[PDB]
Amino acid sequence: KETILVNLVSEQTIPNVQFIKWYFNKKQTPMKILLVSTKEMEQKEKSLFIKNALHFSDSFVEWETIHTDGNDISKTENILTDYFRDNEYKNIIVNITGGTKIMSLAAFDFFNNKPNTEIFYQPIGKELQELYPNKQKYDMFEVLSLKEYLDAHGISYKYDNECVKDWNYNKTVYDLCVADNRELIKGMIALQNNSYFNNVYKRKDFLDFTQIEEEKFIAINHPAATKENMIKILQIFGFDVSRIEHKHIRYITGGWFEEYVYQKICNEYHNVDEKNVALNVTIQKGNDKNELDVIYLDKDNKLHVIECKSFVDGNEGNRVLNDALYKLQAIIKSKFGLYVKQHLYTKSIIEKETPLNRAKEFGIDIKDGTQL
Amino acid sequence: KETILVNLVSEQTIPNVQFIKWYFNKKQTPMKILLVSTKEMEQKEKSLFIKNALHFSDSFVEWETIHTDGNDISKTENILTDYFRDNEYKNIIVNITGGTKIMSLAAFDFFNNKPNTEIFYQPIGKELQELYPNKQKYDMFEVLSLKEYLDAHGISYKYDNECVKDWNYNKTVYDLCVADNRELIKGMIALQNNSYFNNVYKRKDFLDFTQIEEEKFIAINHPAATKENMIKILQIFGFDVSRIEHKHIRYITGGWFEEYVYQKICNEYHNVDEKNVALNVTIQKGNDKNELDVIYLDKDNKLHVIECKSFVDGNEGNRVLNDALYKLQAIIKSKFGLYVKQHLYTKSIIEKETPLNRAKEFGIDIKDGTQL
RNA sequence: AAAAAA
Predict the structure, then answer these.
(1) B40 touches B70 (CB < 8 A)
(2) Binding site annotation covers A163?
(3) Which residue numbers delimit the Card1 endonuclease domain (chains A, B) (predicted)?
């Protein structure tokens, strides 16, 4: 390879992904990428995440990571001296944005005033800056797919964007079906949680369920949960009582609001491409797996995570806030390494003197009934 | 002044305070301090905080802040060139630890290989490094007083380290007074929160509980809070019932546990100096004020904040964690700019798979009854 | 924006 791109590895991989995307999409040539990293970064497999985010073919783009001490300026300059000794590259492109402060300093001092060399720096929101040999700025924004963004964190994911009802239905399902049957739906919630119904769904056989051909198992129950009442609430939502799938029970007990939020984003949110929105998401990294209601990556490459809670009954305000804070910080941040925008959507009305009103002070955006 | 110290200003002031303290205590000479800052840091008054942390006399140490663009290498080198044009300093001492990457880079390139100049860098936990003209490391640890640490964040504070009972008493007060009288103490908690008692202590320094009319105890409307019960619990704790101060009621309702924690630190914790421990702290910054149970700055200059909750009865798990998370993140961090180690101390037993057990995943260290 | 685009 006659062109080499040098990047410094730090905790945030997206800037390096964007710089490499920017250069390749402009030049479209075979090249080598040199990642300058450290022990700490390599323990977190950051070089692998950057490579996977780009998904080049190894026949066209060669990758190599070399290792330095993040606080040792002489060691970084020495390993760069060794690497480039007797080199034959025609173009050396250096991005000093990442790494430690000392790594950036050593890289700049090594590459400054060198022939066939260009040095760049990317402040977060500002333009990409060429520092050498010409001082000038370039508009740099490469849009990432949601898959690229999550691969950049080493995160695999599954999702289910197939909705029980379409957007026209979900736009009005609250006023026409949910609002007047809250007590019937409470009975269906207890039915979903009963171990007979929960276990009778075998997951491959017993994929559908005839509610007619079924005795008074509805007996182990919550009051509203009577056989005919469950038949009624299923017909209110337009379901075939002779073939009730578990996804249909989930819809009634709260899935409708998840679909509503997902479909509202795909149909109305303008800073979001629908191909970067996902519903009923399971994320996995190593042996950690977790579920997210709705996520989307906006056109600014910022990841949004939404907790959909159709109703919050006021006495559980502290528990709902705790669960939300736990999902964002302990799980998404500490175990997955994701820095996201957090949202809580609810059809309930959030009063100012409730614990849930504190969510905004934790950085959680709340959209309550007065906005939905 | 023949000696000038150059420091770069960023969000965290303690490293600059430590470096300036380190050099002055070693040289003990008049000097000038040059702070290289930005609009963003000076909007936060960071230069003022650093100066107040050092509390030099202006007759001996001169301060000046100059302003640069945090992402502009040419502007930083230009303003340093202008500042030092025709200078006659005998010693130029540069600490490039703070600021942005670009500020550190520009400063290093300007000062490297300059006469009568020494350049230093302070990696986080690591030793202080001289980068130029000699590569060598120095043992650096300057201990800060608690007042210095808080002045470094622009925080004024008041505290009350005078305990109602001594450590010998508080070591055994749980077994001998609290454990067997919990229901009487619930009555005193309701008494402290009653508006009669709360308001009469604003007009009086002490009450005589024998002369108080029974109808004011019945106005509390707590079953345990009867005149005779409150007289008894006060005598159990050894107080003069004819002269009850509000601090005595506070002791019974949970202050005993704050004193126990505070005194346990001063008597048993060895990585902390007793002069850097404070009890019942009120912190103030601008128009924001809040109260902290116990705080201490350890001998590694790290600030610890303890929430003392004598008892959490399991039903209050979500609220207590929410309250603690709110005090740590929304208040202490976001409004006061403090990066602390958070602890929650309780005499209760925190079972696993309870909401309080999640605190460790938020970074909150819990010491429950099995440790106290 | 000591401690890893910010």
Answers:
(1) yes
(2) no
(3) 247-366
